[PDB]
């Protein structure tokens, strides 16, 4: 996360980290949506142009991490959207990971809500801010050392959703309805973005109707990090929820 701040303890208890099992390597962010299901970006698990094609047995997740607070879980199975377009523009960039066994909730481990139609309709508006969290790089590039851009605490940044014409205008990539973009404009002064390692992590919004946090996005792709006139692109969670529900209904008994 670029231009964010240290998360407060328990601020993002649905936060999940996706790791290569052995040897160890932080791969992506993710989010906890029930005691057994984790949501992430498809490209975190399957991306042939970088020779990426992980199975359940290649991976571990970490949950409840801020900085015995923290839980390590194995995966039973991975499910990637059947119409995820890795060849072109990362359309439908979404995947589910089923934990080997359910996790117990605590003060530091608690699931985020998935939006329904009404919440998505109300809140997915230009200028409305959501929140992105992750263990990704603090800047696109480092000046003194490799570790000056790796954070010691979970990072948080609030970013406004951007007008669709501005999103589309900002890139040559064909963007679809299954993507939205977020971030400040050059003239707005304020800054912030996801960066390397934040992919797959959540873009959340707090409902004014019921004061619950809802995951509206999944960190998907960008062009560099925190560049003037560029925006982060996020998978539109609600637009793909029937698929999420189909997977949980089929494989979640």
């Amino acid at each position: 996360i670029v231009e964010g701040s240290d998360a407060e303890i328990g601020m993002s208890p649905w936060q999940v980290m996706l790791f290569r099992k052995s040897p160890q390597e932080l791969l992506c962010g993710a989010s906890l949506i029930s005691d057994r299901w984790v949501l992430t970006a498809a490209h975190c698990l399957l991306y042939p142009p970088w020779d990426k094609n992980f199975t359940e047995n290649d991976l571990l997740v970490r949950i409840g991490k801020h900085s015995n607070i923290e839980k390590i879980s194995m995966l039973e199975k991975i499910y990637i959207h059947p119409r995820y377009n890795w060849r072109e523009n990362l359309d439908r960039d979404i995947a589910l990971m089923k934990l080997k066994k359910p996790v117990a909730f605590s003060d530091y481990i608690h699931p985020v809500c998935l939006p329904d139609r009404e919440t998505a309709a109300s809140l997915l508006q230009a200028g409305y801010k959501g929140r992105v969290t992750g263990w990704g790089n603090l800047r696109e590039t480092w000046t003194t050392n490799i570790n000056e851009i790796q954070p010691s605490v979970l990072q948080v940044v609030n970013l406004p959703i951007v007008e669709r014409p501005v999103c589309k205008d900002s890139t040559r990539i064909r963007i679809t309805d299954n993507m939205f973009c977020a971030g400040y404009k050059p003239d707005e002064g304020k800054r912030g973005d996801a960066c390397e390692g934040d992919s797959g992590g959540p873009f959340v919004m707090k409902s004014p109707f019921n004061n619950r946090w809802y995951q509206m996005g999944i960190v998907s792709w960008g062009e560099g990090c925190d560049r003037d006139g560029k925006y982060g692109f996020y998978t539109h969670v609600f637009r793909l929820k029937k698929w999420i529900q189909k997977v949980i209904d089929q494989f979640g008994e």
Partner: peptide
């Protein structure tokens, strides 16, 4: 939904985090 989206250290204790108001203000302005 169960208790989804309600944080044990925040909503459940009637505490606000340091920047959530900024999010809600953007919806209302």
């Amino acid at each position: 939904e169960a208790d989804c989206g309600l944080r044990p250290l925040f909503e459940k204790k009637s505490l606000e985090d340091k920047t959530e108001r900024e999010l809600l203000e953007s919806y209302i302005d």
